[PDB]
């Protein structure tokens, strides 16, 4: 079973701008582990698979979270550190293109449809249970959990928003945007690491390690 109540609980339990962003990322990685432990059945996966899932999913998971956190702000993102990054500040730091993608493809779209915290939590749980993650000892088990999440998400959407039959699909169809943005954010992170003039903390650094 995969109750949306437990998924919302997990969300509520955890509730140079590039430097501030990277500092926020590291901080949130610790919080991400605690979030994942609160997602039903995650903790009962083999430890190595928990590792694979979080290493595969961390960037999209963090991106989804800060994007939804920023829905009430115009032309900016809210970091969990309490810091705001304005569009202008991002642009002035040479990261304007990817920042604008986050705002247009994620934040504004979450705002437009009033994505709620249960829906966000479920989307994040779907991302977490990524059966395509390489090295999984039992991909079918992870596929099964993902199926349970999106079965539960749809039921939630049909009950809470019966006037919006396309809402469930609309939620899922932000996932390709999240995937591409996640990949581009990672590319920037690897560059910041390569260049060496951006402090990267230990957990964030560990995520940039090879498998």
């Amino acid at each position: 079973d995969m109750p949306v109540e437990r998924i919302l609980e997990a969300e509520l339990a955890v509730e140079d701008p590039v430097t501030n962003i990277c500092q926020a990322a590291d901080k949130q990685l610790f919080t991400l582990v605690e979030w994942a432990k609160r997602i039903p059945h995650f903790s009962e996966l083999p430890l190595d698979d928990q590792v694979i899932l979080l290493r595969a999913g961390w960037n999209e998971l963090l991106i989804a979270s800060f994007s939804h956190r920023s829905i009430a702000v115009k032309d900016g993102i809210l970091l969990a550190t309490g810091l705001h990054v304005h569009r202008n500040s991002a642009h002035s730091a040479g990261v304007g293109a990817i920042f604008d993608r986050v705002l247009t493809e994620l934040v504004s779209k979450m705002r437009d449809m009033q994505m709620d915290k249960t829906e966000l939590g479920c989307l994040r749980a779907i991302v977490l249970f990524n059966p395509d993650s390489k090295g999984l000892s039992n991909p079918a088990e992870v596929e099964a959990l993902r199926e349970k999440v999106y079965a539960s998400l749809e039921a939630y959407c049909k009950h809470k928003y019966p006037e919006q039959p396309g809402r469930f699909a609309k939620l899922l169809l932000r996932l390709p945007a999240l995937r591409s943005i996640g990949l581009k954010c990672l590319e920037h992170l690897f560059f910041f690491k390569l260049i060496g003039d951006t402090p990267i903390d230990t957990f964030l650094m560990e995520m940039l390690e090879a498998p």
């Binding site: 610790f30 582990v33 432990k37 430890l47 928990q50 590792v51 979080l54 290493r55 230990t202 957990f203 560990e206 390690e209």
Partner: peptide
């Protein structure tokens, strides 16, 4: 991946 393992351990 020592940090992740440790945090997941408990």
């Amino acid at each position: 991946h020592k940090i992740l393992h440790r945090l997941l351990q408990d």
